[PDB]
Amino acid sequence: GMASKRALVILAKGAEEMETVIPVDVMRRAGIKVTVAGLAGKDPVQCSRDVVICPDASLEDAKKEGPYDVVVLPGGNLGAQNLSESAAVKEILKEQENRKGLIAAICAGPTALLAHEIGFGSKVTTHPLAKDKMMNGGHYTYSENRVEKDGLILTSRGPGTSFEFALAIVEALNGKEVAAQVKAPLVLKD
C-alpha cells in the first residue's frame, strides 16, 4: 500500500529513556521501520534514569544502511552532549539535511543540531532549560510551541511532549489520517 518509511533513532549513554521509547513505540505503531542505533556500538545503553535499552544495531552499521526518512535525536542532557561530540552524528545529520530529509529532535536533543551546524535560521523549540545553550549565537528563532516544525526541522520540548512529537513525525511521514488512527488507542488527554 503506502510507501514504506524508515527511521534512525540515535541512542547515546545518558539519553532520556522516555524521549527514546515513546517515539520508537509510536513510530512502530505507525508501521515505520525503526532502527535504534547505539552511538557507542551494539552494547546496552544506560539511559539518564538508569533504564538500560539494547540497541537494534550499532550506529556504525546502521549508518551504512540508510538513507532514512527521519533521523531522531532523543534528549537527556548527557545524551545530547554525547550526540553533539560525535563526528558520525555530524555526518548523518549533514547528509540528511542535504537530502532534504526530516530531522527530529526533542528536549536537549536540538542542541546537537547547533553543535553540528544543522538547520540554522529555522524556528525551533527545546526544553526550557536548554534554551540558552540552543540560542548561543542566535542561529535559530526560539518557539514555545510544544512541537515546532520549520521545513525539515522538527523539534519538541520534553518528556511530556513526547507523544505530540512522535505523532508529528508520523504525520510528516505517513499523513494526518495515519497519525489520527495511531493516536486514538493511546488514551491521550486531547
From Swiss-Prot:
The stated induction of this gene product is:
By hydrogen peroxide and UV irradiation. In pancreatic islets, expression increases under hyperglycemic conditions. Expression is also induced by sulforaphane, an isothiocyanate obtained from cruciferous vegetables.
The record lists the effect of residue 180 to T as:
No effect on detoxification activity on methylglyocal-adducted CoA
Please describe, based on the UniProt annotation, the reported consequence of changing residue 54 to A: Strongly reduces chaperone activity and ability to eliminate hydrogen peroxide
Q: How does this chain sit within the bilayer?
A: Lipid-anchor
GO CC, one annotated term? axon
Impact noted for substituting residue 54 to S: No effect on mitochondrial translocation neither on deglycase activity
Catalysis performed (reactions): N(omega)-(1-hydroxy-2-oxopropyl)-L-arginyl-[protein] + H2O = lactate + L-arginyl-[protein] + H(+); N(6)-(1-hydroxy-2-oxopropyl)-L-lysyl-[protein] + H2O = lactate + L-lysyl-[protein] + H(+); S-(1-hydroxy-2-oxopropyl)-L-cysteinyl-[protein] + H2O = lactate + L-cysteinyl-[protein] + H(+); N(omega)-(1-hydroxy-2-oxoethyl)-L-arginyl-[protein] + H2O = L-arginyl-[protein] + glycolate + H(+)
Q: State what changing residue 52 to A does.
A: Disrupts dimer formation and strongly reduces ability to eliminate hydrogen peroxide
A Pfam family cross-referenced in the UniProt record is DJ-1_PfpI
Any idea which residues bear N6-acetyllysine here? 149
Q: Which NCBIfam families match?
A: not_thiJ
The protein depicted here goes by the name Parkinson disease protein 7
- Please tell me the species this chain comes from: Homo sapiens (Human)
Query: What lineage does UniProt assign to this protein's organism?
Result: Eukaryota, Metazoa, Chordata, Craniata, Vertebrata
